[PDB]
């Protein structure tokens, strides 16, 4: 009685475009074109697909199948699979928090640009502003200029001294105080996700119609726009020129694996939640297949969208697009790409749809990000919770604002990197490995093939079987070992992070991980019996 059976989605296309909305984000736009053109160019497509087929797709489809089959949250599903690994559901809840502290501040920057892009003369065109230094040298100014080590462009000056105000902080040590503009921007973001999540899957699923389709439109406008620019073939040459020798490096495969994993994002509980609210009779194999193939191809065309404008920018400057595309991160889109689109007709248009496109890219993904955690807590503490959804949703949203207050600082950008590199990647890889191993090895991949066989009507192929049993946990294990062995020294804006950052990072990387061995200790520590007896009753799910 009472609630009993769970709710169901409003249409097939909503959940298709919804999982597509989670899959597609900023990184699809600029991360993949950079990592592609840097690691052997077009040849990077060869391992990228392999790491997709053997790694990303199986985790994606396994996660999705479990989600639609068991209809449980990220915490409650472990109660009915492997209770000792229930802490996994908790770990994600912490991980997501760390992500929601920086991912939306980027959307706040794109939002600050968007509202600052309504003026007839764009701010980052002239140097006669209140934030530019004496180094600021700009165009529509005398030709022959010969750039100096200390000179700075109006776009770099605008991004550095205004929207970030990063010159007012010395690094991780001193980063305060808070830029209230980005606080209001990210507040508006938390509002626009508040009215798109608070109701549940119906609103996220309806806002997704806009948040997942518009990026293709803006990418299409900047695509046909960037294609008509003179000398844009340079960026395409640098973008797709095959350099097969780079394929001999054992690093490149690692980069491809990490890319496809962190662009499909399986085992994060978001796909579990998005899959939970669907029909048991409804097919999901085709769903997972098509959805991934969209995320990959969308990245492929996004490469052109970026490197066409970068090619035109390298033509107006002096070629070897790599030099104009050295820095990967927020500067490739907020400085180089913005300064590139500044010299184009009706620049207000392309600017508005560009930064609006950035916000539109982050919105759907963060919808899904929150959706997974919300589903997990509501399903884990029912009746004690579900009293209202706006209460718990409001709680997690304002929590994400207070979490971003460290990021809204002057040196917030610094923290963004520290959180983007150190915290998420190793832990997420770990929980994906433990999750995959627990579904494929503990629960038994045989019974999983029986669950899919009861789901779609047919048992999954021997390919999916061997991928889940061996190829996928080895796929995650690869990136785990390669990551731990060579953690990266990182620098941003002529500032090398202190030696101790990794320590801090490891804290932020493990402070979220402590819950699973301590929960195994809590489960095995709480029920008396013998060690062999209690772990045998704790590995087998509920019989009824």
């Amino acid at each position, epitope marked *: 009685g009472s609630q009993g059976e769970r709710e169901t989605w409003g249409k097939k296309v909503d959940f298709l475009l919804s999982v597509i909305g989670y899959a597609v984000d900023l990184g699809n736009v600029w991360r993949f074109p950079y990592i592609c053109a840097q690691n052997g160019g077009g040849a990077f497509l060869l391992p990228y697909t392999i790491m997709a087929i053997f790694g990303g797709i199986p985790l994606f489809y396994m996660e999705l199948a479990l989600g639609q089959y068991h209809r449980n949250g990220c915490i409650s599903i472990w109660r009915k699979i492997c209770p000792i690994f229930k802490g996994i559901g908790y770990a994600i809840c912490i991980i997501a928090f760390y992500i929601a502290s920086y991912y939306n501040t980027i959307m706040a920057w794109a939002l600050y640009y968007l509202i600052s892009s309504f003026t007839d003369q764009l701010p980052w065109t002239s140097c006669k502003n209140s934030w530019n230094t004496g180094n600021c040298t700009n165009y529509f100014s005398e030709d*022959n200029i*010969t*750039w*100096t*080590l*200390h*000179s700075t462009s109006p776009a770099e000056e605008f991004y550095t001294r205004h929207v970030l105000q990063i010159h007012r902080s010395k690094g991780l040590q001193d980063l305060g105080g808070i830029s209230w503009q980005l606080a209001l921007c990210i507040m508006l973001i938390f509002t626009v996700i508040y009215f798109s999540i608070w109701k549940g899957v119906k609103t996220s699923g309806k806002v997704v119609w806009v948040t997942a389709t518009f990026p293709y439109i803006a990418l299409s406008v900047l695509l046909v726009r960037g294609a008509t620019l003179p*000398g844009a073939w*340079r960026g395409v040459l640098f973008y797709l020129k095959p350099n097969w020798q780079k394929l001999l490096e054992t690093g490149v495969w690692i980069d491809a694996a990490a890319q496809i994993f962190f662009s499909l994002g399986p085992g994060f509980g978001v796909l579990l939640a998005f899959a939970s609210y669907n029909k048991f009779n409804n097919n999901c194999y085709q769903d997972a297949l098509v959805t991934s193939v969209v995320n990959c191809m969308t990245s492929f065309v996004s490469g052109f969208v970026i490197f066409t404008v970068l090619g035109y920018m390298a*033509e107006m*400057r*002096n*070629e*070897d697009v*790599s*030099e104009v595309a050295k820095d990967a991160g927020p500067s490739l889109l907020f400085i180089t790409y913005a300064e590139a689109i500044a010299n184009m007709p009706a620049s207000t248009f392309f600017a508005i749809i560009f930064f609006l496109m950035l916000i539109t890219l982050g919105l759907d993904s963060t919808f899904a990000g929150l959706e997974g955690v919300i589903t997990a807590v509501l399903d884990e503490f029912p009746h004690v919770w579900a009293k209202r959804r706006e209460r718990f949703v409001l709680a997690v949203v304002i929590t994400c604002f207070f979490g971003s207050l460290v990021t809204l600082t002057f040196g917030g950008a610094y923290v963004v990197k520290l959180l983007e590199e150190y915290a998420t990647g190793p832990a997420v890889l770990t929980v994906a490995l433990i999750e995959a191993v627990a579904v494929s090895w503990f629960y038994g991949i045989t019974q999983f093939c029986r669950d899919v066989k009861e789901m779609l009507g047919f048992s999954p192929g021997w390919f999916w079987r061997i991928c889940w049993v061996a190829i996928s946990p080895l796929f995650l294990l690869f990136i785990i070992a390669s990551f731990l062995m060579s953690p990266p020294q990182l620098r941003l804006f*002529q500032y090398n992070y202190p030696y101790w950052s990794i320590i801090l990072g490891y804290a932020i990387g493990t402070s979220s991980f402590i819950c699973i061995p301590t929960y195994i200790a809590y489960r095995l520590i709480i029920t008396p019996g013998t060690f062999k007896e209690r772990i045998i009753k704790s590995i087998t799910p509920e019989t009824p």
Partner: antibody
Amino acid sequence: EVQLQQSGPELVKPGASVKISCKASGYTFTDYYMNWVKQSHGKSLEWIGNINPNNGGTSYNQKFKGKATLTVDKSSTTAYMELRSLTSEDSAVYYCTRSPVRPYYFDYWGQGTTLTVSS
Amino acid sequence: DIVMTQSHKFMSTSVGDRVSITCKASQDVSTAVAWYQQKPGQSPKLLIYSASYRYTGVPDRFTGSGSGTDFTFTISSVQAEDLAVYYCQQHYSIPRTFGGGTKLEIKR
């Protein structure tokens, strides 16, 4: 005006090391990249690498990686290039030349440094 | 990398004649070629940058042209002191490479 006074000629036995100076003057030293070009007898110019005087930002050439080491000192506005594992091919004239960051031309050069690697 | 090829190692000209040295690059360069003048016994002296622009302190008799891959250095009034070895160098892709060097010998 702008002057790049290099060091005198050096006669060094093969297998040893040799350091060449480059006293820069006449401009804001921290405003320009400091480059090193190699010129073999009867050969063309060969770009060794550059250095950012502010933080010692050395950007070398794959052909000279581990062959040359560029350093810089702001307290005296002087850039140095050290060479190890000296052979008969290194017996060439070396120049230190100033360059902006873009466009990357070599506006002012030094008088050259005659290096002879022989026992 | 980039290979700057000066096919003609030597070029003969006379005082007052119109002389032009060619320069072939590996790939497309747009307008990123600088011409240097190394007089026998002196350091290379910068004459042209970015294909056509002249550098400061260079007489009007030195000009530059070309757009794409092949570029040309022109002297209208050759003087007795214009006797030198001319090099061409690209300035877009890392690393920066030079030409083989064209010695300009004067005929009398």
